[PDB]
Design an enzyme around this catalytic site. Structure first.
Site, short mmCIF file in Angstrom:
data_model
loop_
_atom_site.label_atom_id
_atom_site.label_comp_id
_atom_site.label_asym_id
_atom_site.label_seq_id
_atom_site.Cartn_x
_atom_site.Cartn_y
_atom_site.Cartn_z
N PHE A 125 0.83 -1.28 0.13
CA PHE A 125 0.05 0.12 -0.02
C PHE A 125 0.91 1.24 0.12
O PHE A 125 0.43 2.47 -0.72
CB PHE A 125 -0.99 -0.14 1.28
CG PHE A 125 -2.02 -0.98 1.22
CD1 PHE A 125 -3.00 -0.96 2.22
CD2 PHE A 125 -2.09 -1.99 0.23
CE1 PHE A 125 -4.07 -1.83 2.16
CE2 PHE A 125 -3.04 -2.99 0.26
CZ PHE A 125 -4.10 -3.02 1.19
N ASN A 128 2.21 1.86 -3.44
CA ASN A 128 1.38 2.26 -4.36
C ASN A 128 1.04 3.74 -4.00
O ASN A 128 0.70 4.56 -5.22
CB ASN A 128 0.02 1.59 -4.27
CG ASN A 128 0.00 0.33 -4.91
OD1 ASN A 128 0.93 0.10 -5.89
ND2 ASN A 128 -0.74 -0.62 -4.69
N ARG A 305 6.78 -5.19 -6.46
CA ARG A 305 6.44 -3.83 -7.21
C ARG A 305 7.32 -2.96 -6.26
O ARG A 305 8.10 -3.28 -5.27
CB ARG A 305 5.07 -3.66 -6.25
CG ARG A 305 4.48 -2.19 -6.57
CD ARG A 305 3.25 -1.89 -5.74
NE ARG A 305 2.07 -2.72 -6.54
CZ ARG A 305 0.98 -3.08 -5.92
NH1 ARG A 305 0.90 -3.08 -4.60
NH2 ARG A 305 -0.13 -3.80 -6.50
N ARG A 332 3.62 10.41 9.78
CA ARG A 332 2.86 10.78 10.87
C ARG A 332 3.56 9.96 12.00
O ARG A 332 3.07 8.68 12.08
CB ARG A 332 1.19 10.58 10.56
CG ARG A 332 0.49 11.02 11.87
CD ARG A 332 -1.02 11.27 11.77
NE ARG A 332 -1.82 10.15 11.22
CZ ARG A 332 -3.04 10.13 10.97
NH1 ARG A 332 -3.86 11.19 11.36
NH2 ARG A 332 -3.74 9.01 10.60
N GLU A 424 -7.06 18.74 15.76
CA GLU A 424 -7.94 17.65 16.04
C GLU A 424 -8.27 17.53 17.65
O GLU A 424 -8.85 16.30 17.81
CB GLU A 424 -7.56 16.53 15.28
CG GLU A 424 -6.22 15.94 16.05
CD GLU A 424 -5.63 14.86 15.11
OE1 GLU A 424 -4.44 14.18 15.26
OE2 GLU A 424 -6.50 14.17 14.54
N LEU A 451 -12.43 14.05 12.57
CA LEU A 451 -13.00 12.83 13.32
C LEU A 451 -12.26 12.79 14.90
O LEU A 451 -13.21 12.46 15.70
CB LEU A 451 -12.69 11.60 12.38
CG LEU A 451 -13.25 11.59 11.19
CD1 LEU A 451 -12.63 10.82 10.08
CD2 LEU A 451 -14.90 11.26 11.01
N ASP A 452 -11.10 12.73 14.82
CA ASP A 452 -10.51 12.92 16.29
C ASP A 452 -11.22 13.99 16.95
O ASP A 452 -11.52 13.89 18.12
CB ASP A 452 -8.92 13.29 16.21
CG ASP A 452 -8.38 11.88 16.26
OD1 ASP A 452 -7.41 11.76 15.72
OD2 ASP A 452 -8.64 11.15 17.45
N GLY A 607 -4.57 -2.17 11.24
CA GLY A 607 -4.71 -0.88 11.93
C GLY A 607 -5.94 0.08 11.16
O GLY A 607 -6.17 1.16 11.59
N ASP A 622 -10.26 3.87 11.02
CA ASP A 622 -9.20 3.81 11.99
C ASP A 622 -9.70 4.53 13.37
O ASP A 622 -10.79 4.40 13.55
CB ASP A 622 -8.17 4.50 10.79
CG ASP A 622 -7.91 5.99 11.31
OD1 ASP A 622 -8.78 6.80 12.02
OD2 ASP A 622 -6.82 6.43 10.75
#
Ligand code: GXG
Ligand code: MG
Ligand code: MG
Ligand code: MG
Length: 716
Positions: A125, A128, A305, A332, A424, A451-452, A607, A622
């Site tokens: 991921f 990508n 990949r 992060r 947040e 969202l947090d 996660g 998440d």
């Protein structure tokens, strides 16, 4: 007996070996000096870290008691705000100022466009995502619901030319809207040529140029029969691929094969809310992926990949220039709360995880400042760290001091390590100007992590009464003021041309038609970036920045003050409001999304998961979305909207449905019927029934404990 002694620290051997053998070589940092610096930074800064966490608890206790001590019907805002000022929650606003952050790349200071977030523990991921700087518009349109699957335009196992032609037509309209011709429409084009450094588009009965020839940026192949044409609009590149011998090109009136969009301009490689990492083994997996990204040699299985190289073009005049092939990478880090036993001290006390992330992700990021092929990441010399979940300006100042001390250990110039500030948490929102000032020489973005922020809104006012349903939260006065207030503070601090003003994540991963229709609101609100969940969504959200001139929007917003402190402080209390079927839907929806996320967290260490909600909408979950759901149910239980039997029955009802959705994974362990034997089910129950007692409503303490418990049981 599995640890290494350095001063007062006892380092897990897997982490010691990873740093010595993989992270340190090539940085010219002496290994003994590095580990002595780790010991000294941990010793020096851990007391203030703990002091700050204690300060959160003392403030929340005072706010809890304030609400319990009163009976009056509506919040008396004047009394409430004066109270928040007395206890030091609301601090004075500093005088106007302009940030001074220097050495930042153009992708952050200047380019407006999508920002992708990906779990760093998933190497394929993450690859990508780094490669998502460039994406196929035809793939994004054909493969999603942006082109409706009406009668005749359905996706099947093979190419549907009726659908393909709708894709072509959609893209031709995009071209007309973004890089318009002097006369005519791209829909009628029959060919492209480059003559005396100018683009000439052949039409059926004439030829034409661009209305703005300055949007012509280059080409590949011969000028008189190019293999592609590169355009630029609002600072973002568009590439028309020309190949009449391709499947799609054979059908196209101009032989066009695809339209490639510069998409994920920057990407956040996430160690926080989208990964599950509870010990040194987990942290090393993530650090090693972050290392492979910065060295340029990460390669994942399923064939293998790799990272894309940069893209070569011929300038309209004639020179050979190059464009970045990869997204500019942030990392992060975790925030100030958690410890991790990857390092313990001589008394067995775990070391603060945010401190470790600064040291280790900062060390590793040095490789992205040097040759891999050319250097991978920042050409201007910066390391970009997103710092989440901070509460107020003293906590921002602490992050800056932590970064300063890490720069010394690493032998880096001061202020190399830049900070993307998440807005947040409520105590950051209402002190936002002071938070930016504390990082005035390091800040590279602010972003409304809504969202947090919603989870903190619920926990902070937990004792005030029952809150509105979580779907109502997105339209409550407090959150609308919070979004505008964030933009206002960024622009007033001089972010235009200097730092990103960012907004939040689109979670409905398959509702791409809805994303294209709705998420345009974010650049219209002056945001120079916003969060997408996938490379496909990055390509589609790029359309919004071609339609909206964010630079012009920001200039028009300058000087405005569109949110009051009273608006920011409007608690989302429900009015005196729900039929029993609506209450039941809210409980079942929250329990289903909690269980679907938590079961893969605890039993498989995943996660971030796509979890269908009660309406069968696939949502990327998440920790932040979990924080909302568990806090809302905790609030409803606290104030008598639902009973403890309601909660238990909902969890037991939704658990087998979650089991069914996961039935195809040999690593999945069903929760039902033996609920009390499932550590995952008990974790989900604990997140609700103990939610009011978690610090600021955070989910990590329970999740980390339950995941470690599961790992121990699986090892015995
Ligand atoms: O709004 C906040 O607090 C965030 O920080 C957003 C976040 O992690 C996230 C999320 F909530 C769902 C899916 C993917 C994500 F990256
Ligand atoms: Mg967040
Ligand atoms: Mg324009
Ligand atoms: Mg408490």
């Amino acid at each position: 007996t599995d640890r290494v002694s350095v001063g007062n620290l006892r380092i897990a051997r897997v982490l010691y070996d990873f740093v010595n053998n993989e992270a340190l070589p090539g940085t010219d940092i002496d290994p003994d000096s590095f580990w002595a610096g780790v010991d000294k930074v941990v010793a020096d800064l851990t007391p203030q870290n703990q002091a700050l966490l204690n300060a959160r608890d003392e403030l929340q206790a005072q706010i809890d008691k304030w609400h319990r001590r009163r009976v009056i019907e509506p919040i008396d805002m004047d009394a409430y705000r004066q109270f928040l000022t007395e206890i030091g929650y609301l601090l004075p606003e500093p005088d106007d100022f302009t940030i001074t952050t220097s050495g930042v790349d153009a992708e952050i200071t200047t380019t407006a466009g999508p920002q992708l977030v990906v779990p760093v523990l998933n190497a394929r991921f993450a690859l990508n995502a780094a490669n998502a700087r460039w994406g196929s518009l035809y793939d994004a349109l054909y493969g999603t619901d942006v082109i409706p699957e009406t009668d005749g335009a359905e996706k099947g196992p093979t190419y549907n030319k009726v659908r393909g032609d709708k894709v072509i037509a959609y893209a031709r309209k995009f071209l007309d809207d973004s890089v318009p011709l002097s006369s005519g429409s791209f829909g009628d084009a029959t060919g492209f040529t480059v003559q005396d450094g100018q683009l000439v588009v052949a039409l059926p009965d004439k030829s034409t140029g661009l209305a703005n020839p300055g949007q012509f940026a280059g080409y590949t192949g011969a000028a008189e029969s190019p293999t592609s044409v590169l355009l630029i609009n609002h600072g973002l590149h568009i590439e028309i691929l020309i190949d009449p011998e391709s499947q799609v090109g054979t059908t196209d009136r101009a032989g066009v094969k695809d339209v490639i969009l510069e998409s994920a301009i920057t990407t956040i490689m996430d160690f926080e809310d989208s990964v599950a990492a509870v010990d040194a083994a987990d942290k090393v997996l993530g650090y090693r992926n972050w290392l492979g990204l910065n060295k340029g040699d990460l390669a994942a299985a399923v064939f293998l990949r790799v990272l894309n190289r940069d893209r070569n073009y011929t300038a309209p005049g004639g020179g050979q220039f190059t464009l970045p092939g990869r997204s500019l990478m942030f990392v992060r880090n975790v925030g100030h709360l958690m410890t991790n036993d990857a390092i313990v001290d001589t008394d067995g006390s775990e070391v603060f995880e945010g401190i470790m992330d600064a040291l280790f992700t900062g060390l590793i990021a040095i490789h992205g400042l040097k040759a891999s092929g050319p250097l991978i990441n920042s050409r201007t010399g910066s390391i970009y760290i997103v710092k989440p979940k901070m509460h107020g300006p003293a906590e921002v100042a602490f992050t800056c001091e932590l970064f300063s001390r890490v720069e010394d250990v690493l032998g880096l110039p001061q202020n190399t390590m830049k900070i993307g500030i998440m807005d947040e948490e409520r105590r950051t929102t209402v002190n936002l100007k002071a938070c930016i000032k504390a990082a005035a020489d390091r800040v590279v973005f602010i972003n409304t992590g809504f969202l947090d922020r919603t989870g903190d809104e619920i926990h902070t006012s937990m004792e005030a009464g029952p809150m509105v349903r979580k779907g109502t939260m997105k339209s409550q006065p407090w959150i609308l003021a919070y979004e505008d207030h964030n933009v206002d503070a960024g622009l007033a601090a001089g972010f235009s041309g200097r730092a990103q003003v960012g907004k939040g994540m689109w979670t409905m991963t398959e509702l791409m038609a809805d994303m294209v229709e709705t998420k345009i609101a974010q650049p219209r609100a002056g945001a120079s970036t916003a969060w997408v969940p996938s490379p496909t969504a990055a390509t589609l959200h790029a359309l919004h920045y071609h339609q909206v001139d964010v630079a012009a929007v920001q200039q028009g917003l300058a000087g405005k003050r569109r949110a009051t402190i009273e608006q920011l402080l409007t608690i989302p209390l429900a009015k005196e409001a729900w039929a029993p079927d609506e209450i039941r839907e809210e409980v079942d929806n929250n329990c289903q999304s909690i269980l679907g996320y938590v079961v893969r967290w605890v039993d498989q260490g995943v996660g971030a998961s796509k979890v269908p909600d009660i309406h069968d909408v696939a949502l990327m979950e998440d920790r932040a979305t979990l924080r909302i759901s568990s806090q809302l149910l905790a609030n409803w239980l606290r104030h008598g909207v639902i009973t403890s039997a309601d909660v238990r029955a909902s969890l037991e009802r939704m658990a087998p449905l979650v089991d069914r959705q996961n039935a195809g994974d040999v690593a999945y362990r069903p929760m039902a019927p033996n609920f009390d034997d499932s550590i995952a089910f008990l974790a989900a129950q604990e997140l609700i029934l103990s939610g009011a007692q978690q610090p600021n409503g955070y989910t990590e303490p329970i999740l980390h404990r339950r995941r470690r418990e599961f790992k121990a049981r699986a090892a015995e």
